């Protein structure tokens, strides 16, 4: 996981600083370790170690556990540091599904990690008072309504709460309070009757204290998986099937967990009555749609029952496997051409196959199909079976069969995407550092205008800003800006493939 460690290091350096990213990388590489050995191995002062650990545990990146002799050990969550990159996508999806109020709520929750409901609604009101003008004030009522609406949809979840010290072992305080998680009050918001109006940044006791909230990344991952499945089935059959499967997944969201081979089956009657009335679709049309989706050779849905009219179920693991297969065939096509993609799909459909059979079934002339096969072998896109006639395993007396393993190829592609995003971040930081001189020059020549904006603002300071030598350098500034924009766009768009591969790898494990 060297690429993962490098990506986490880059993220922690760009987001938190230097003295904290070292502690984070040490925790990721060495695992759970007490505080004193961490401070000894890192080589910095104890106060910096404490500050780094606290600022990491605030954003739920690391956890602390008790062990023998009452020692506390801190373990980092590399998965959480990787999910930290998905913050813009989380904000975009919470702005799409909800209003800008929920957008600001999720933004503050991600930027602070753990906060109380009063604090987040106050910050959201203070930030939204700037969006509007003309003396209009922001009340806490609609903000609390949006917060509880996000809560009942499991998008925001209460942080693990420390048990009561008086009731649980009254006496000597333990080194760690041993925070536990309760599912009863996991999504129960507190009753806060106090309201207020946000201030407009003029620059001229807590009822919900102890109750901290955070963003439930599992709900966002489930929503992204549902959106990906809907987009796939829309590209496959039609938009009507996409709406049908969207309604089915919306019904299944509540009654199912985040990891299950099959969801809870639904009947045709409840799917018909739950479908939005905007579609002029009858019962028989829905029955035909379901029975044609069940016959799809991709197995997105399944019958799995005949009671209650049309009883149907949705295959989640099969859909994720199909999405991973599509991603792999797409990257193969874009990296080696359409003919190599044809060979890949041939060797994927046929579980085991040889060179002559590949040439016969793909109709690709010799000296070229073998070349693409060897190229894919050199990039770990497939593995040879090598069935031996004799235990000597001599090459002259054995058969070599080509076979694509989706799991290993998906893991390799995920590692490649991690290293790609790491290289993109490195290139962006390099371009920023090499041009920091022009950046400071532009910042100064623009702060000349930013200073004395209204008070003592003479017009004689507007025709001298571009008089300097910065005007021919504005072209280099624009090139740097567009390069950074494109690098960030690519880094964000690779995160979708990363999410797909990570979901495929997670849903195929048992964790026994």
């Amino acid at each position: 996981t060297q690429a993962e460690i490098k990506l986490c290091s880059l993220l922690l350096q760009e987001h938190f600083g230097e003295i904290v990213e070292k502690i984070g990388v040490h925790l990721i590489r060495t695992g759970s370790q007490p505080l004193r050995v961490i401070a000894h191995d890192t080589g910095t002062s104890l106060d910096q170690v404490k500050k780094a650990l606290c600022v990491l545990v605030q954003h739920n990146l690391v956890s602390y556990q008790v062990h023998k002799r009452g020692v506390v050990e801190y373990e980092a969550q590399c998965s959480r540091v990787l999910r930290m990159l998905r913050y813009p996508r989380y904000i975009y999806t919470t702005k799409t599904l909800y209003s800008d109020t929920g957008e600001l709520i999720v933004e503050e929750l991600l930027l602070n990690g753990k906060l109380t409901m009063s604090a987040v609604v106050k910050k959201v009101a203070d930030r939204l008072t700037e969006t509007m003008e003309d003396g209009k004030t922001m009340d806490y009522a609609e903000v609390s309504n949006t917060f509880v609406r996000l809560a009942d949809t499991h998008f925001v979840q209460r942080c693990p709460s420390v048990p009561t010290t008086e009731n649980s072992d009254p006496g000597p305080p333990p080194p760690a309070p041993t925070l536990v998680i309760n599912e009863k009050d996991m999504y129960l918001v507190p009753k806060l009757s106090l309201i207020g109006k946000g201030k407009r940044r003029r620059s001229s006791p807590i009822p919900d204290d102890g109750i901290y909230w955070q963003a439930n990344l599992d709900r966002f991952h489930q929503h992204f998986r549902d959106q990906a499945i809907v987009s796939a089935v829309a590209n496959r059959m039609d938009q009507t099937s996409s709406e049908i499967v969207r309604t089915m997944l919306r019904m299944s969201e509540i009654t199912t967990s985040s990891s299950a081979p099959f969801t809870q089956p639904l009947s045709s009657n409840e799917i018909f009555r739950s479908l939005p009335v905007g579609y002029n679709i009858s019962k028989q049309v829905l029955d035909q749609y379901l029975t044609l989706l069940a016959d799809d050779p991709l197995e997105f849905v399944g019958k799995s029952g005949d009671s209650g009219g049309g009883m149907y179920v949705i295959n989640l693991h099969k859909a994720l496997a199909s999405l991973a297969t599509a991603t792999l065939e797409s990257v193969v096509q874009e990296r080696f051409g359409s003919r190599c993609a044809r060979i890949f799909r041939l060797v994927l459909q046929k579980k085991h196959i040889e060179q002559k059979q590949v040439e016969d079934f793909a109709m690709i002339p010799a000296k070229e199909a073998k070349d693409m096969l060897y190229k894919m072998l050199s990039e770990n896109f497939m593995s040879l079976q090598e069935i031996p006639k004799t235990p000597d395993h001599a090459p002259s007396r054995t058969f070599y069969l080509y076979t694509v393993n989706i799991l290993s190829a998906a893991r390799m592609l995920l590692h490649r995407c991690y290293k790609s995003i790491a290289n993109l971040i490195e290139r962006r930081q390099f371009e920023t550092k090499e041009n920091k001189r022009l950046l400071e020059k532009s910042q100064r020549v623009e702060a000349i205008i930013a200073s004395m904006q209204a008070t003592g603002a003479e017009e004689a300071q507007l025709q001298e800003i571009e008089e300097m030598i910065t005007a021919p350098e504005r072209q280099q500034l624009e090139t740097l800006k567009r390069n950074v924009n494109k690098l960030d766009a690519s880094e964000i768009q690779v995160d979708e493939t990363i999410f797909l591969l990570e979901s495929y790898i997670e849903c195929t494990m048992k964790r026994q």
Binding site: K50, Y87, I91, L111, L179, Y212, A489, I492, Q493
Partner: protein
Amino acid sequence: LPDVVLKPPPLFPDTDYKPVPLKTGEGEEYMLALKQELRETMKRMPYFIETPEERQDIERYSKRYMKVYKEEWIPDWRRLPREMMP
């Protein structure tokens, strides 16, 4: 037999396949702008702990004028173990 090569292969061999252009739309641009805003706003956040400057040359009357002032968040010591108190 394979031919002999006088010079090593190029450090970056050319490829006839180019990367697919990035997806376009209001969503991708909004996500890019939001990521840039997060980059700009998270460095000034108190959670972003900077390297403590040291080895001051001299003390001056202008120290109070150039003294960096920034509000510091107070961690909840109830959830955090006792070992991280200053």
